[PDB]
Amino acid sequence: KKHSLDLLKLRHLSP
Amino acid sequence: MEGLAGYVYKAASEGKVLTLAALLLNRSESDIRYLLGYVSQQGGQRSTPLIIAARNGHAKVVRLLLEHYRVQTQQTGTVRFDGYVIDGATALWCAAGAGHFEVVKLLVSHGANVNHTTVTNSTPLRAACFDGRLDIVKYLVENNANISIANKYDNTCLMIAAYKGHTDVVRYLLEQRADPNAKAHCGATALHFAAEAGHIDIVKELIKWRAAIVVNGHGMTPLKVAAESCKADVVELLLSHADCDRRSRIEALELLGASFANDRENYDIIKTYHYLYLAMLERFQDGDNILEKEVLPPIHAYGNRTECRNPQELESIRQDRDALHMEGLIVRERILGADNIDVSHPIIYRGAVYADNMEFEQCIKLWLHALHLRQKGNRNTHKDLLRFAQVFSQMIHLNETVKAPDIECVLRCSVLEIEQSMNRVKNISDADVHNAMDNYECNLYTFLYLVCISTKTQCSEEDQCKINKQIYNLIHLDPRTREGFTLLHLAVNSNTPVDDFHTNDVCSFPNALVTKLLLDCGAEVNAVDNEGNSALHIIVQYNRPISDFLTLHSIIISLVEAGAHTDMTNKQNKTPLDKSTTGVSEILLKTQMKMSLKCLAARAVRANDINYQDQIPRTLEEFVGFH
């Protein structure tokens, strides 16, 4: 089902 | 009382006055103070009634609450519902984060909390900068609040202003003579966040204030950070810093051409060739003090190319698209090294593009290289192993051969990363232990998918021995899920999640080949979960005894032949014959049972509740324990 479309610091981007 | 607290929360949610006035009077002092100073739990999140008053722009109700009472804004609550939901923040924090100026100014007018410090020591100015309203930031700094509040990971408000598209907030912050050379935990100093989202005006604003260029922790200048993310305009602006040097300029142009080759949002192959050619022409422009390419040794993953050290070969690879993709990958690898965070993702994207075009072997090579880089960097690769499980299950469903060394390599990587996931779960107590637990369970499931794929692929004796060695190595760590399931139990269970992608076509649990392979590799056939159910207790509860009776038969034969107890009981004292819940499984197990006087005697001991402690051999106490 389109491997390319299936692709996709979190604590640092918090305010 | 919690009920009247919910009542006044509902009254303040609609922004009404008379309802709250009638619901917050005719009582004593302490209960009313508790009502106005406690949070209500809605939607799984705790929040002050002042939070829901400020979030809906209902400033009149909280204004009259401040007039009629002495309510404070210092109540501990959540931060924001957009994927953070961590507690410790004050009411003024979310009031600034709600984008409502008047509620902020009235909360400042009575008991200002501009210098609030949470567990992340984030002031309400942080949320004001995140929202992007000039008036709130201006008033909050005018309330004598320090703007140099660095976090534990050193996230200045200027950094989150630069990361977001709010140029007004950052220009007002730099108008106040703020620090532009603000070091962070990862080394990213303002411009690294600014030239990551492609905000040209913000980068211009900070270059006007001379934010300066400094290499961060990951060995990336703001210019290289900009070129890494295909943002050409900020690359242009940073290339005119009046101190840039040739080597940096050409490496930035090469990095930009590399990044344009493999990206989802910004994919132009003509821009790839043109920027690579611009950097090559600017390299070989003079003939004196020439800057020749320090070409890395060839990598088997990107074919066998050796970059492009001449403009003639770059000209010859102009119209050949996959050669340009590989060339961009190799020059990106050269510029950002083999140890950067973002060097691995374009490799994965090119692998995904190759897989979508049914070009599988080069896809496997690229994804294996990305896996090796991510494991050298010690990063969470539970998504990459699942990606291998999906593509391997796509060749088998398409009747395509899978290379045995590739399966061995991904299995070794899976075993090692499960070792590090066990270490992560052990080390982390409760910081993000749920995420680590889910990653661990997902890694176990992906290992099972890879083993199931390995069973259906014909391999040589040496490669099969290496695969069995990897499975053996994982078995002798005893990997367990949340509910005590060992690696054998999940291959036996029917509730084991198989991923909704192409893995459904090849990976079906229970699987007789996976169970036989695990038992041959030394799986503890008598191992128990948290409920006490062994591997035999779960196969009997299988609810499709006739549709795949060939599968159900062979796994019970393998389990009994490996040495499972056909009689032992779980924590609820339930023999698998009693827990069979199926006539067919009961018949198979009764056929496979071997009778022993030890089992009957121990069952009689357990049924009659005879005190057996310190009256039997120590090795027999366990036998009474499960029989």
Partner: protein
């Protein structure tokens, strides 16, 4: 008595066991009531409170097998002319002794060894290999 796990002295039990197992290995006519009594002695040793003596019994019978094989090694080495005949006779005797030892030590094999370690018959064969054909491999091959 009974099969109840009881505190048993290791010295006298191991002494009578050592006498009967050297009689078994050397194929001397041992009383069969003694043979069954020493099955019971093996069970008593592998079970006794407060700590099972399975590890100590395994180590002690390993030491006994080692020094008996060493004694046979010295005898076959000093029998220079009839090294082959002496090795054949001692190999027959020790193979029968190892099989009967795996019979006598069945409780260790099925309750301690397999619950890693390696069985008593396998231990006797390994000791015979390492101390009885490994040292004089060259002279036996040349002979």
């Amino acid at each position: 008595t009974s099969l109840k796990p009881r505190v048993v002295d290791f010295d006298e039990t191991w002494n009578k066991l050592l006498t009967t197992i050297k009689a078994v290995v050397m194929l001397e006519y041992v009383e069969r009531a003694t043979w069954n009594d020493r099955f019971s002695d093996i069970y008593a040793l592998c079970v006794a409170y407060p700590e099972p003596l399975g590890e100590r019994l395994y180590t002690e019978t390993k030491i006994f097998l080692e020094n008996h094989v060493r004694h046979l090694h010295k005898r076959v080495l000093e029998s220079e002319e009839q090294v082959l005949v002496m090795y054949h006779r001692y190999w027959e005797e020790y193979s029968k002794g190892a099989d009967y030892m795996d019979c006598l030590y069945r409780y260790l094999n099925t309750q301690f060894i397999k619950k890693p370690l390696m069985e008593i018959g396998e231990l006797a064969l390994d000791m015979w290999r390492k101390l009885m054909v490994e040292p004089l491999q060259a002279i036996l091959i040349r002979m």
